[PDB]
Amino acid sequence: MTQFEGFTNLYQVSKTLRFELIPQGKTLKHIQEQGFIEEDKARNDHYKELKPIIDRIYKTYADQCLQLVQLDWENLSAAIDSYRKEKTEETRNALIEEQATYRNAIHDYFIGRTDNLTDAINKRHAEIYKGLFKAELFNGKVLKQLGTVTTTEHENALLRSFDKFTTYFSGFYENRKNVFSAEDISTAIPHRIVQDNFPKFKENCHIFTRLITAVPSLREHFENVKKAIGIFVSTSIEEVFSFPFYNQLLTQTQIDLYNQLLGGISREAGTEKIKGLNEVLNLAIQKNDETAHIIASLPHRFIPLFKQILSDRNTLSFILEEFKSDEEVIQSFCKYKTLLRNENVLETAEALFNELNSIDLTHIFISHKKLETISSALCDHWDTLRNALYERRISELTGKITKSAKEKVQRSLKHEDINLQEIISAAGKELSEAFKQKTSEILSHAHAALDQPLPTTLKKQEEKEILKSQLDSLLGLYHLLDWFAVDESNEVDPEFSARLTGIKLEMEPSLSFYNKARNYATKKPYSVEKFKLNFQRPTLASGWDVNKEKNNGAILFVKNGLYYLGIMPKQKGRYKALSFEPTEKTSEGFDKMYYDYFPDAAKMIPKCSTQLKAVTAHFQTHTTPILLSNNFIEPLEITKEIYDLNNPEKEPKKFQTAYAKKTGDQKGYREALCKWIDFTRDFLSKYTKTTSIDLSSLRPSSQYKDLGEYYAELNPLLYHISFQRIAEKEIMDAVETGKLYLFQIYNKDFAKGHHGKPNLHTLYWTGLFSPENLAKTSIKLNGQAELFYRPKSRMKRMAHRLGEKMLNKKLKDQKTPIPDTLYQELYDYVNHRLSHDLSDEARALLPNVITKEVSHEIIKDRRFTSDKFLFHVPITLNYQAANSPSKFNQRVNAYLKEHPETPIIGIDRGERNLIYITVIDSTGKILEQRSLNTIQQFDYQKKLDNREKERVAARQAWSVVGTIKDLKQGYLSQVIHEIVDLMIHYQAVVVLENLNFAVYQQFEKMLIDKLNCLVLKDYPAEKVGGVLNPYQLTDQFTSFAKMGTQSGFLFYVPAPYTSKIDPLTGFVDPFVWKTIKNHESRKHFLEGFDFLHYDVKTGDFILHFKMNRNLSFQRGLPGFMPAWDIVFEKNETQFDAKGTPFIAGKRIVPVIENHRFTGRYRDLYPANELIALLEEKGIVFRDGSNILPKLLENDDSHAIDTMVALIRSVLQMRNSNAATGEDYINSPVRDLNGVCFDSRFQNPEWPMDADANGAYHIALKGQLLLNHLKESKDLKLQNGISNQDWLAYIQELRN
Amino acid sequence: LHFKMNRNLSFQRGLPGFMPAWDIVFEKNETQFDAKGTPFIAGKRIVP
RNA sequence: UAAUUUCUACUCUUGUAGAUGGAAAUUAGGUGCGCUUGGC
DNA sequence: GCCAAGCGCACCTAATTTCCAAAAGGACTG
DNA sequence: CAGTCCTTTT
Ligand SMILES: [Cl-]
């Protein structure tokens, strides 16, 4: 049958290995003399500079093409509508093909093949397109065809700097092909137009129509927004929301205008902003009138479009001038500070506020917009003043104080500015005091700021903090002044209004200054970014093949277990190319690699035969055969038949499956396939590069089903590595003269003192060059390697002076870690640098710490304290396999059907736990469960939490933010190790949550990748799990967007009803508490239950609910069970296994302040509160009698309201309170043996907290899938799990 | 939707009334306001 | 409060454990501050 | 003392595309 | 031209 060790060599996997290069002998000296590092640095600099200049060509052309576009978008709309409505593989495939039609339609504008344009323009477009991804960009030919713009002197110097080196832009060309592609790819303009933006534009047109039909007045409002922004002047608002206009929404300039219609335009900070449609809609909904309710029921927000690829952003909003230098900030702000003193702004102010103690405050006005700001500064709460003013005004009304009067008073408080008198009268005298205090504080701080000198630069954070601290003080004053309404609407005191407006205008630049300083000071500090090395070789390390060493300058050696990179630079002057003479393998020296490779035959064979220019040329006129002699030991004949087979009038070629999919001529397909394969055999026998290769493994041509099958057997035979000794003298002399630069390929597994397990990457490398791998390729060495120089980035300050001691983070136990709060204190103490007494806790730890006398100096971040040469080299694992797997999930599902004892690992993201694992056996029972907050005695949760606090704190203080991904990757690396070990040990499936229902998303990617190619260090190379037989347990990762619910052994399930579920019964709270809001609802709710009786044996109350009842309040999830005995557990003391007490039946419910306000939580005891409520009303219950009729016999609103609350609380299984770290599950129903589940008992056979319960039910959903698999006839997994299926499944299992 | 009372007799109740024809109207489902200022949607129906 | 291709956690061990697909290009989103009009 | 819609700046993070090449082709230089 | 070596290709 199937086997777990069968899951190997199923598809190829590529990885890059990274190493340090250590130069050998005179290499470094020669590198210095020749000026290679500086030359390469400079080439990089020129690239970053020339890149935007060259992009102007791409951008310009793109737009010229897009301006011309004019399509009908109805068909695409209909495809989208149809898929939306039907959700089927048929409508999905139609949409995909339709999108391709539209992409190609756009693409035709670029390549000059659209029937919408004059044949002359197509000819121009086709000419330009042929030269966009090659050296024609540099000559200026393309730029001539494009506009009457020319290049500057400095632009031309940059272009000429890449003379004979334009190949440095090889990747860049691929990147730019990615912009213009008609393929279904995210990088491309047609994809952006057709699949991103059009759907959004379409949605907006729909949204518009619904709004202006339901509330026509909105049409005018929107038209006016368009006018007030001054865009789309000749286009109606109706036209803007119709499909024809989308043809004018393709270029970046138009998109930006459309987005500004939606989003509005700002000016200088402090100026009123012009509103967009989205703001208008928001305001209308916030009126909370009847219209608002109607508008809010509809979609009420337009979707802005994404940008066009490559194109430059443009905005009508104001953009601030940037500060360029530290000196420019300090000089400006000093001039303006000294100017503020010469203007005597603070004394003017101090006097303005003293007028307030005398002047008539009836003519002093506060701006209605600042009333809640002032209530917060000077009063208890934000609402204090508003409420004060309201209560005082409604007391000033005459006659029947109606609801309409009360409403008018409220409206008034928003529309009119208030005089200080009325504020002071309405609030207390504590307002006039708080104002004086707050006034003096602000001026005090202002004073101190202007008196304090600025620093000399802004290098250190302490200097930044001074700059910011001062700005904050000036800003504090600018705010204070902005409290007062100067507007001429009111009858303000004329002098006060003049003098205030005086200082406002003198304080206004403070805002501009604040933003500019921050915008400058929060910049990232310049780093020294590593750069590519070419050593004057445009194709350095491009490929290793022996024919290409002359051009590519890169070779590998091995000598006594150490690996070396030979680089052969083109040095200043005239030298004969270096060549190595092999010798007897006795002679001392280096084993040089000899790498023979014929790359992918599918492309290379046509390249070297059918697609030759002379062949193409010949078959354009002639019909006869053509004989190739050059690079053929014997002539290769090419017939029209062969040529036609690979150069068809239209795709596909006869020998591709897609032809058999289309034409259905399966007699034809095979006749071609056999002809072509025969042709490849004729080639391979004759081409100098492949003539000697033994192809006898390959079957007759007719026996191949698809071509991809044939290339997958062929390609392995076209790659070989061997070694031959090169004399020591020959190598060493070459380094001496400088014809060869020799680097040791180095990582720390090659250190003198290495004595432990190597890195996995070291395993890949030594596995690659092992005898077994050379005899039979498991791992291949790939071309396009890269060398880099990385300058020193951190100063060589030693982190261990000779006398100093270092303190282990763990005690003598070698297990128990020192608390974070005590580590620094103890470090200082043992190094005799504590300025004060030792903490008592720390003095207790002292006799069990481990210190170490620094014997040798060791530098912190030593790796970065020196310039370094680096090397990145790609390899391919599982080389014998295909590039892509075939039916991977089915191979797994077959293994699974044949292995029903397979256990399951459920992995949950938790509320109180970053990641939580529960392992179950195949009968549903828990084998293992734990939180992964702490791994290796390190609390990664606390660390991540603190780090993210530091980052936030940093942003706010204008200090360096830094990274968190490094720490995340750290943690997840360990989590991955633990899961993988579990998977192998249990041979288990792994089941994650589906996020389509942070650390977890990251975790998913890392886990999937790992299991794409899983090597275990301890396993021997020839065992499955060894470096020459990687496990492959997940399906080949392509993209998240393409990922199904199954990736091999990894399964995704929906999150609902996995936490808030009883592990003993599968009970879930079956009620929507929306549909229980009113008195008449609450009553019908209670009438739904059959009885409520007290059980004098247990002391619990029993509430019976038939499931075929009160269906009006159910979520529509009957599950399996007909009825539940809901239990109000008696509030008695129980004891967990450790011995800790807890109160049974306890609930943790939000504390509610009148209406809707919930900050803290509180402990509730339902059973006891029910006893309270019954004894209140004198209902007898210890007889065992039904209580429900008695509760609603008199229609007491409190009595049946209290009931409803208690019932709901009981049904709240999950009861958590972060303050105390409770997060338990207590079930409201008893299982078959008469026990209510409480997780607090801490029984290890069951979930031990709510998060563990989650992990368990995630596992169990996976078990559902697996159980449905065995019963299935197919190897197909069911797609999704409806809540109902889930509940009927699990409830049936447990009852 | 224009209807003459003399058509569709098979489907009528034999009550021709006084008008020979009626323009039956599907009202745009737009917001309107009552005297007290409460809104409603024109042409709305409430069906079983 | 230290050593690394690089990251994280370490320090019996001049180093240990685990991880590690690069490079280029692009796009989306997030956090923080400032401001605008509004809502409680 | 939060929130809604939005505009401006700083930086950080994550997703998705291409390549992972020997040799044909032809520009350049005596 | 004939060779060399960067550019472009399948
Ligand atoms: Cl849940």
Ligand code: NA
């Ligand atoms: Na090691």
